[model samples]
Target: KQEEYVKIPKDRIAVLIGKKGQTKKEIEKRTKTKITIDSETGEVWITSTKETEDPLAVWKARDIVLAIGRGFSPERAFRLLNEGEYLEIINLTDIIALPRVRGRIIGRKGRTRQIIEEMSGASVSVYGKTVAIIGNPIQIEIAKTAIEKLARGSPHGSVYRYLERR
Candidate 1:
């Protein structure tokens, strides 16, 4: 039996539960695991079922929960359940001290982030001083490189060029 625990933002609890608990149920169904959420405290427990042969399912469910907590929509977070896909969370504050860091990554009208997604085929979420990415291994690496460059105050054009080269 495998089990994991995750703590998400308190405000995101509703999103995790979704309408009528459909999201929670869907995660359980797909991963063949059980999820117990503490709505008030934003804590979650993931436990595998008797039929679950692969221990990774619990970790998969954990990533989905953490993704949602890190500001990814449930739909985007669900990608982690797919084969070869993954989730990466970067703390922007850890890399840069500027409060405008999020804006830099997001760019004007979200054009910059969109360019990165389009070029890298990765999904990005900028929320509360953190950036989360979802994609296959290659896409994740490329997106992470581009995002790190942006976070380090590289010019947007240069970052786009860097991604273009990848």
Candidate 2:
């Protein structure tokens, strides 16, 4: 048997556990791993009981926990289970401390975020100082570049054009 651990932020632990532990149950069932969660410290331990279980499921479980902790709904975060799907997280602090940059990425009333998803076929989540995206390789590449452009002060119009060309 193999084991893996993921640390979830306290505030998100309830959401990660879901109503009546359903979220945790789903991941355990799907991944074929045994899961134990510590509510106090927000520690999750995943053990692989079946030798046939894919080792990558442990990593995927950790990513799913992080995606949830980063503000993705369980339903949306579950997309990581799809073949070729992935999760990419960009730290705003790395770009700049400007709260207004988040505004730039979000655009007026979330239009920019929607445009990035519509154009690139990616799911986006803006939480705290991190921006998370879930999609396939090409989609993730396009979305990350578009977000970086916006964070770096690119005009929305130009980013839109760049996405169109991609």
Candidate 3:
């Protein structure tokens, strides 16, 4: 058996646990891992079962929890459990002031974010000073580059051009 731990924001704890613990139960059942959540601290414990044939059960469970914690909806976050799908988180705190950087990445009325998703075929979540992405490797690469460009102050038009070339 193996174990992993993740600490999420207190506000997200309920989302992770889901209504009546259904989301938690789904994750545990799908990943072959047991999840124990500490509501007070927002710490989650994931333990892989010995009988599980897949060695990555624990890791997948961890990613699912982390994805949800990072602002992805449960349905979107669950994509991490599938083959070829991955998650990437970009922390905006170090790049610039939180609000500005987040604003740039998100753009007016979330159009920039939506464009990035449409062009790159990646799912993005802008939450709590962080931007999280979910997609296959190529999609992730494209989306990450575009987000980075936006974070660094690239014009939306240019970023769209860059995405277009990719």
lDDT of candidates 1 onward, in order: 0.90, 0.86, 0.90
Query: Candidate 1: global Cα-lDDT?
Result: 0.90
**Number of backbone clashes in candidate 3:** 0
In TM-score terms, which candidate is top? 1
**Shift in Å, residue 28, candidate 1:** 0.6
Off by over 4 Å in 2: none
Q: Give the TM-score of candidate 3.
A: 0.94
Model 1 per-residue lDDT tens digits across residues 51-123 = 6659888889999999999999898899998989889998887766555888888899999999989999999
The all-Cα superposition gives candidate 1 an RMSD in Å to the true structure of: 1.2
Q: How would you encode candidate 3's per-residue C-alpha lDDT over 20-135 as one tens digit per residue?
A: 99999999888888999999999999897865557687888888899999999899999898888888888877555778898899999999999999999999999988889999
Task: Tell me the TM-score of model 2.
Answer: 0.92
RMSD of each candidate relative to the true structure: 1.2, 1.5, 1.3
Weakest 10 consecutive residues, lDDT, candidate 1? 93-102
lDDT score for candidate 3 against the true structure: 0.90
Residue 53 alpha-carbon offset, candidate 2, angstroms: 2.4
lDDT of 2 by residue, 1-166 (tens): 6788888778889998888999988988777777788999989887887642588887777778888988899988989888788898888878655678889888888999999999999999888879999999899999999999999889878999999998
Which pairs clash inside model 2? none
Alpha-carbon deviation at 119 in model 1, angstroms: 0.8
Error of 3 at 155 (Å): 0.8
